[PDB]
Design an enzyme around this catalytic site. Sequence first.
Site, PDB file in Angstrom:
ATOM      1  N   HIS A 336       0.788  -1.242   0.000  1.00  0.00           N
ATOM      2  CA  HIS A 336       0.000   0.000   0.000  1.00  0.00           C
ATOM      3  C   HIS A 336       0.823   1.297   0.000  1.00  0.00           C
ATOM      4  CE1 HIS A 336      -4.003  -1.837   0.674  1.00  0.00           C
ATOM      5  NE2 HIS A 336      -3.317  -2.772   1.306  1.00  0.00           N
ATOM      6  N   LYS A 527     -10.153  13.520   3.136  1.00  0.00           N
ATOM      7  CA  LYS A 527      -9.233  12.418   3.419  1.00  0.00           C
ATOM      8  C   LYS A 527      -8.326  12.854   4.562  1.00  0.00           C
ATOM      9  CE  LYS A 527      -8.938  12.912  -0.641  1.00  0.00           C
ATOM     10  NZ  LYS A 527      -8.792  12.687  -2.076  1.00  0.00           N
ATOM     11  N   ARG A 528      -7.367  12.013   4.946  1.00  0.00           N
ATOM     12  CA  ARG A 528      -6.363  12.401   5.949  1.00  0.00           C
ATOM     13  C   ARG A 528      -5.527  13.586   5.464  1.00  0.00           C
ATOM     14  NH1 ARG A 528      -6.227   8.491  10.429  1.00  0.00           N
ATOM     15  NH2 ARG A 528      -4.230   9.426  11.085  1.00  0.00           N
ATOM     16  N   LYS A 533      -1.011  15.113  -0.146  1.00  0.00           N
ATOM     17  CA  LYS A 533      -2.319  15.100  -0.768  1.00  0.00           C
ATOM     18  C   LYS A 533      -2.732  16.510  -1.157  1.00  0.00           C
ATOM     19  CE  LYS A 533      -3.999  11.023   1.753  1.00  0.00           C
ATOM     20  NZ  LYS A 533      -4.504  10.457   0.478  1.00  0.00           N
ATOM     21  N   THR A 635      -9.086   5.133  -2.597  1.00  0.00           N
ATOM     22  CA  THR A 635     -10.358   4.461  -2.680  1.00  0.00           C
ATOM     23  C   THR A 635     -11.419   5.557  -2.745  1.00  0.00           C
ATOM     24  OG1 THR A 635     -11.150   3.994  -0.378  1.00  0.00           O
ATOM     25  CG2 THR A 635      -9.243   2.761  -1.161  1.00  0.00           C
ATOM     26  N   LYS A 639     -15.149   6.764  -5.327  1.00  0.00           N
ATOM     27  CA  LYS A 639     -16.503   6.919  -4.886  1.00  0.00           C
ATOM     28  C   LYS A 639     -17.065   8.114  -5.601  1.00  0.00           C
ATOM     29  CE  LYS A 639     -14.458   5.620  -0.355  1.00  0.00           C
ATOM     30  NZ  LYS A 639     -13.623   6.235   0.741  1.00  0.00           N
TER      31      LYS A 639
HETATM   32  C1  PLP Z   1     -12.021   6.297   1.673  1.00  0.00           C
HETATM   33  O1  PLP Z   1     -11.118   5.526   1.354  1.00  0.00           O
HETATM   34  C2  PLP Z   1     -11.914   7.096   2.938  1.00  0.00           C
HETATM   35  C3  PLP Z   1     -10.704   7.686   3.285  1.00  0.00           C
HETATM   36  C4  PLP Z   1      -9.546   7.664   2.315  1.00  0.00           C
HETATM   37  O2  PLP Z   1      -9.918   8.319   1.124  1.00  0.00           O
HETATM   38  P1  PLP Z   1      -8.851   8.525  -0.064  1.00  0.00           P
HETATM   39  O3  PLP Z   1      -8.341   7.181  -0.527  1.00  0.00           O
HETATM   40  O4  PLP Z   1      -7.698   9.365   0.428  1.00  0.00           O
HETATM   41  O5  PLP Z   1      -9.542   9.228  -1.208  1.00  0.00           O
HETATM   42  C5  PLP Z   1     -10.561   8.297   4.526  1.00  0.00           C
HETATM   43  N1  PLP Z   1     -11.618   8.318   5.413  1.00  0.00           N
HETATM   44  C6  PLP Z   1     -12.821   7.734   5.074  1.00  0.00           C
HETATM   45  C7  PLP Z   1     -13.966   7.760   6.043  1.00  0.00           C
HETATM   46  C8  PLP Z   1     -12.974   7.121   3.835  1.00  0.00           C
HETATM   47  O6  PLP Z   1     -14.170   6.540   3.501  1.00  0.00           O
HETATM   48  C1  NBG Z   2      -0.280   3.399   4.058  1.00  0.00           C
HETATM   49  C2  NBG Z   2      -1.629   3.673   3.463  1.00  0.00           C
HETATM   50  O1  NBG Z   2      -2.577   4.019   4.159  1.00  0.00           O
HETATM   51  N1  NBG Z   2      -1.712   3.510   2.144  1.00  0.00           N
HETATM   52  C3  NBG Z   2      -2.893   3.870   1.390  1.00  0.00           C
HETATM   53  O2  NBG Z   2      -3.471   2.677   0.862  1.00  0.00           O
HETATM   54  C4  NBG Z   2      -4.707   2.941   0.191  1.00  0.00           C
HETATM   55  C5  NBG Z   2      -5.414   1.638  -0.197  1.00  0.00           C
HETATM   56  O3  NBG Z   2      -4.630   0.874  -1.127  1.00  0.00           O
HETATM   57  C6  NBG Z   2      -4.454   3.819  -1.034  1.00  0.00           C
HETATM   58  O4  NBG Z   2      -5.705   4.126  -1.650  1.00  0.00           O
HETATM   59  C7  NBG Z   2      -3.709   5.099  -0.671  1.00  0.00           C
HETATM   60  O5  NBG Z   2      -3.220   5.665  -1.889  1.00  0.00           O
HETATM   61  C8  NBG Z   2      -2.514   4.812   0.243  1.00  0.00           C
HETATM   62  O6  NBG Z   2      -1.939   6.029   0.749  1.00  0.00           O
END
Ligand code: PLP
Ligand code: NBG
Lengths: 790, 790
Positions: A336, A527-528, A533, A635, A639
């Site tokens: 990942h 996101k985080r 990002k 991910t 969405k």
């Molecule tokens: C979805 O994966 C999601 C994230 C991470 O999103 P990104 O992959 O950075 O687009 C973080 N927090 C929640 C609640 C999600 O559903």
């Molecule tokens: C360490 C970690 O959280 N990795 C995360 O893994 C998710 C699911 O594969 C990816 O969508 C994202 O790009 C990546 O930053």
Amino acid sequence: NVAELKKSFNRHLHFTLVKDRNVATTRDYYFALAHTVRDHLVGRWIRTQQHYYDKCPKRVYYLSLEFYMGRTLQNTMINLGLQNACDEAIYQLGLDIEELEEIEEDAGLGNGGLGRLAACFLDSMATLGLAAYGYGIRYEYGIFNQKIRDGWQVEEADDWLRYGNPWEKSRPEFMLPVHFYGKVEHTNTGTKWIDTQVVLALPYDTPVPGYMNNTVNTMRLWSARAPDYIQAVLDRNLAENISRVLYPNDNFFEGKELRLKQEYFVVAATLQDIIRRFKASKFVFDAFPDQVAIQLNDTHPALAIPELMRIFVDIEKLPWSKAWELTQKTFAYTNHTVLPEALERWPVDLVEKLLPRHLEIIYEINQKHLDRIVALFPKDVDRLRRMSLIEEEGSKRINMAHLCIVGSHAVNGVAKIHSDIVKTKVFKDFSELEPDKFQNKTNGITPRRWLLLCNPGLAELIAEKIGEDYVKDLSQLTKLHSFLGDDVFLRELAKVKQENKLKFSQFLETEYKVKINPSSMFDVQVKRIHEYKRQLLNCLHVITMYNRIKKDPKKLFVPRTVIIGGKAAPGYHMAKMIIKLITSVADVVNNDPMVGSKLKVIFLENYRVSLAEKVIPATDLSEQISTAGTEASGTGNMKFMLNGALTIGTMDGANVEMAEEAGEENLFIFGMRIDDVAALDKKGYEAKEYYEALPELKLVIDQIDNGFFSPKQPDLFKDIINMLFYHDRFKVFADYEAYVKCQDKVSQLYMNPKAWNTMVLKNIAASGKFSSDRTIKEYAQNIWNVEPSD
Amino acid sequence: NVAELKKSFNRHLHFTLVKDRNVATTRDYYFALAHTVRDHLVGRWIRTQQHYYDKCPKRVYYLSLEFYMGRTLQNTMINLGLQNACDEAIYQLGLDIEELEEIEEDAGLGNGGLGRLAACFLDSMATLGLAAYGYGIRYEYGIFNQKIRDGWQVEEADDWLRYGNPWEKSRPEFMLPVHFYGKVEHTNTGTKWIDTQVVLALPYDTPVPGYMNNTVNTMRLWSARAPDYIQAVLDRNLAENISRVLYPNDNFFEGKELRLKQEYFVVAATLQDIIRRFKASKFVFDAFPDQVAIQLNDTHPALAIPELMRIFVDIEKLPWSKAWELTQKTFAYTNHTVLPEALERWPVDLVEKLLPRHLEIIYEINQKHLDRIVALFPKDVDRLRRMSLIEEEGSKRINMAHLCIVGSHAVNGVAKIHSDIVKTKVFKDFSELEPDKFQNKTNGITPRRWLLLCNPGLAELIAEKIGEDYVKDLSQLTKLHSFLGDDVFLRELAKVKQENKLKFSQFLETEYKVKINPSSMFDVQVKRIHEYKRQLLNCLHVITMYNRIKKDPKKLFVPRTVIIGGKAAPGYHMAKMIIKLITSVADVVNNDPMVGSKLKVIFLENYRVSLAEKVIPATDLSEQISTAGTEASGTGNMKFMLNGALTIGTMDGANVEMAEEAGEENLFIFGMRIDDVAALDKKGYEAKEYYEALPELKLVIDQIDNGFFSPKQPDLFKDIINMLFYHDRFKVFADYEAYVKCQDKVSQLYMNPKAWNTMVLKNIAASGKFSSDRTIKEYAQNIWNVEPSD
Ligand SMILES: *C(=O)c1c(COP(=O)(O)O)cnc(C)c1O
Ligand SMILES: CC(=O)N[C@@H]1O[C@H](CO)[C@@H](O)[C@H](O)[C@H]1O
Ligand SMILES: O=C(NC(=O)c1cc(F)c(F)cc1Cl)Nc1cc(F)ccc1N1CCC(C(=O)O)CC1
Ligand SMILES: O=C(NC(=O)c1cc(F)c(F)cc1Cl)Nc1cc(F)ccc1N1CCC(C(=O)O)CC1
Ligand SMILES: *C(=O)c1c(COP(=O)(O)O)cnc(C)c1O
Ligand SMILES: CC(=O)N[C@@H]1O[C@H](CO)[C@@H](O)[C@H](O)[C@H]1O
């Protein structure tokens, strides 16, 4: 049927909850109804498990530290096709169904995308009728609650188990011991890991309910416990401290001994339980690779590898070569991570202190690993220290990704582009040695949680037009390409957005101090929070816009509502600083009615899956504005597409193949490709250039530095500027200019409703690949090597 | 009925435990049974509680740091009249009832008899239809588990919530904040306790069924909750650390801050919950005492007197005088203690740091108190320092027994001779001022647990000869006097004892490496190991016996089985020592081939309520052998009486009142009375003047000293020989001979089936008074002023 559901709801409120309708809380009803919803699943959970036991298919095991599961109640009804009748039972019983659902806490047992990926996979593996599981730590406090207090991230405990959990059921008969510390002993009856400390791992089940298929998988979460006096009794707290709080490190290795414990723990527990199951069934250990796949979700459970060998070598007394074979066969690795700061590299003393036996097994596995590379590259010596599991500088450390590659049979990346990098670049040394081990598996997102449930408008709209097999086989959405013409349809689609947007805008007004414009363009970046990002890159453009309103408010401005949100790690000082700014920015733009209703900036406090479930459907512009080769897949980016949002984003992460499905124009790609990034890395970042050569940007950066947003404390944001001007690994300015230009592109489209909508219908049709159902198949046919059914 | 019980058992195992019978565990079976038994008790629990809430009768509040409650499943079946119909139902499902029942963990949240008094009364208040509650801490760990390693007591965590407890139901809506530390401001709006630290108290209700009467009362137990980042989360333990473990200090005051916290924790929660409820009733606060009654269960909950007073003056803003008049009106105190080390003396420093407002009030209350005596006794200088609430000598120590007296309208002892001494000797100063305040309530035991439950046998035969009136009105057991010369009823009694003996003989043979003589006299001292209780006396007689075998193994020695059991408190080295001795002797005894089936000696491992329920029913002789005027009453003694065991014991505690009912001929009383001891203290108990004066004793002592029972560790015991000779407060030697002489009459009478049995019958007949149902009647009438109903 409704009636018997009505009954079931009351027999619990009476018997389980001990309450009259006269005195029941909002909470009490939830539990009454949750129990009703768990009830009608128990049937197909016993059978499903019974079945996978009776018949022995190859069982899958998704071993992860994170399962970002969110809310179970609604989801289960939807998946069990019992929602409608449940909604009806609660109606006739004059109760507010929404209210009850909101009582339920986020199983915030994961940080970000990988957490949600572990979650979504569960959903599919069930819906696919795959005999899969879910192995994880039952954390008592998940990811923290985020409070915006004086524009600063405040964290609180995620005390989600305070009152309880109807979804989980303890499995006491299956409780296992786990050992930490002590000395390794070398004797005649082989080698003994003597004199050790024991934590009981108590395993808890939660049902992964397939989507209308009768399959109900297990998800196993473990919890800890121990086998003057007072203090000694109180001291049991330290053993039950392994399963207490999940670590809040989205893309960051923080190598804390407690975490290290957490890792081993969820691994020894799992492998023990798994081994017991194998032997418990209708099967030496020769058969084991054919009976078990273990997908190591990233480097996190790397410790499973040496543990499996431990349980073979030391416990099954199986001869090494043979046992080292099956470990490779059984295990696999989904990688990942990219950012080096996100790679788990454990100090050896630590491992020597904590798991001495696993250090001998890592030192041992490493030994041979090099005995081969010396019989394959005799002259070469830089390759040796380039492939060893030990980094022999200052403090020696184990590379956990290296151990997962030498220990697996199939390493993969999470989206075409990223995987391309993992194979040919990041691990060019291992891949060359056997490429057939490195593959790609582009991420997904269950159209159950993220369609049927959270945007029941869209889900239904599409359902009236083209059957509902698309909920099972999602790559049906292409059948909306035939609706590109229809006038009625585009306008029907836009309705669903407007609805979503309006209901979300009410939430937003009743939570914050903001007049939300219900016909504005919803710009969402959730996101985080992380320099990589680029919420910062967004932020500047948000400032940039403010700057266009002052000079001239009389120009017809495309009215938009920015909404950024996300949990910054506690340790991440820089991200927290970006937030403050984002909120500071928010404060200037909200109240200043020179601009007024033209532009609003909402920061979403405490973003979590159930909150994502809500905002995503009411979005126009997805922000996926990471840096070339930072996002591994995302991910979330998926969405938004699947929800009627247009994506603004870089040719980075699955954003790349998202275009490969919709068309490069139907998505707003801007900024420099991974190649352009590598070109400028040769020339090396020179932040000032754009600060000089950008009449606009510079103003933004003057306002930050002088104290336009922080007056009562002018400097504050210096920290930021020092990162932006001298240490910006994610090149905020470098792609500012493409971005801002690519922001006008979006603005000018949004004027034409009949066109945006057409560009949307294209996105929603060509989001079929990203159903996690597909990923699983891919994973099934190539890695775990199993077969779906029902 | 038989059928529905079966269906709900099967239904529950299925939906709650999610098991199929094929793989359901023994434990799953219990849980399903538990839940089924609960379901027929819910409807009454709700009515009961609504009834109180509706009609608003005066409510009793037993405030205790200890409920020695035992298991609930069997008792609960009994009171709901369901045992029979459940014995059948389990029997038909082919499971053994007996087996399920032992899966349940002892809810042993009590040190000893005081713990059990709180439990016993809960049963009785429930049956006497009274509107009562029981408020205690819900200790995660009750009184510890006890193992015997190399003849030593090893402590173990009573981890009774590990698997979960089907009989509690959390009350998330009756959750209260509790406060600690901070400071005290005195302001224009009364005084303020600010800057305080917060723990939450979450209450967990438990049904306390009545014996066939439609009243199922509540017991409300509380657990603690909070309101680097990783480290901050882990620190929350500290808060939850207040409800963590029960203190194992039987009759001892070690004064630890955690315990002070336990004490404020239970009380603060308790009071606020009572008030909020009163404010919720039909009822300024002048109704309060007429609506509420709090019995103070020993001093432990003493902090209530000021706590209310805080809540009274500071929250409700009531004029001191008003608050005080009512404080004493609602608080009633039970004195349980005799020993000077078991009084709760809190060192002011501590009470300053942790509860500074409560220290203010403790002072003010005490100021007005010295006012009274200055007023009456303006020359009695020494009386003021004696009768104060503060012991100024050295580190200023709060006498908490005074706190209760001064602030209670009733102060009671647990026996005729107890309350007696407490009235005139231990508290002369206060009772001379208010003689009327001080009363007696002779202790009692609940005959549902101690007859119907642990003894079907008697309960049946009695219930066959004189009906079942006797359960609810135990004073009916005099109706059994009509059978004193009923040869057959006599012979049917010895048989009930026999079976109890034999079944329990089997318990012993399966739990120990020892052969039980099925016809030995069952000699049983079960009670928290204590110097004062003289288990050491008993011990010495076990030796004195063994030698009468050595001196001539051809003489008729009456076969007896000595069974001593109890838990030494961790701190109590002297207890833990005596234990090693008993075990040491035991080994030798059960191992000298020359005795064989003449004399067996077993220590009782992990003696607890449930395990009392075993041994007690199968006893002939109950050792009640504390030094005169060291036992306030005892409750143990009381059972054995009512299970056809004759007591051997000092004219101490309630053993006197047992003589009052049954007549001294029908007990074995021995040794010196309080007065005889008194004189020997005015004489001085020079210890060695017996080891010279008695040949047999010499040998016993010389054997403990010179190593007979301790070859490998010969001096091991010196610590005792020294204590006996030089520090024996309880005069083990002094009452030796008396005891041993008394012992012969037991041995002799035993050889007379008819004469013994006749005696046993007189006991069971006269046992009437020692009902905790009678004790309640006395409490309810002359202290709580409440009426029983249904
Ligand atoms: C979805 O994966 C999601 C994230 C991470 O999103 P990104 O992959 O950075 O687009 C973080 N927090 C929640 C609640 C999600 O559903
Ligand atoms: C360490 C970690 O959280 N990795 C995360 O893994 C998710 C699911 O594969 C990816 O969508 C994202 O790009 C990546 O930053
Ligand atoms: O339905 C209940 N249920 C319980 O009280 C109850 C709930 C539990 F969760 C439990 F474990 C035990 C009980 Cl007994 N009560 C009720 C029903 C009515 F229709 C009207 C009034 C009440 N009262 C009873 C007294 C309560 C109090 O004094 O705190 C308040 C609610
Ligand atoms: O009845 C059950 N019930 C559960 O397994 C069960 C229990 C829970 F507490 C829960 F929360 C969910 C389930 Cl599904 N199982 C069962 C029933 C049979 F008739 C025959 C076999 C089984 N198996 C299922 C698989 C198990 C394994 O993989 O180790 C072993 C027991
Ligand atoms: C029963 O009363 C009992 C006691 C009482 O002991 P003593 O009266 O002090 O002899 C102590 N412990 C348990 C478990 C009991 O059931
Ligand atoms: C400190 C303490 O637990 N005191 C105990 O109180 C019980 C219950 O009344 C009495 O039977 C007994 O004499 C005494 O040991």
